[PDB]
């Protein structure tokens, strides 16, 4: 249980995006925001 | 609809979390593992 890797890949981009949004509408919330931005971006392509 | 402040308060230290997750047991997907690990942080006190 130590890992010999330390490089998130998809990671970067995926966060970036984050600070774009919760930035541009402020939510009353992140962990909240962030399970409903996310649960939904499962369903994305629909 | 513009805004004029860009400092996510309380969003270093969440997301600084995150990577020390993520990388602590590399999950099969983040999207998914973003909802389930914020989805419970909301009941984390329980």
């Given at each position: 249980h130590m890992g010999h890797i330390q490089?998130?890949?998809?990671?970067?981009?995926?966060?970036?995006?984050?600070?774009?949004?919760?930035?541009?509408?402020?939510?009353?919330?992140?962990?909240?925001?962030?399970?409903?931005?996310?649960?939904?971006?499962?369903?994305?392509?629909?």
């Open positions: 490089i998130p890949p998809g990671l970067t981009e995926l966060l970036q995006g984050y600070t774009v949004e919760v930035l541009r509408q402020q939510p009353p919330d992140l962990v909240d925001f962030a399970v409903e931005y996310f649960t939904r971006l499962r369903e994305a392509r629909r």
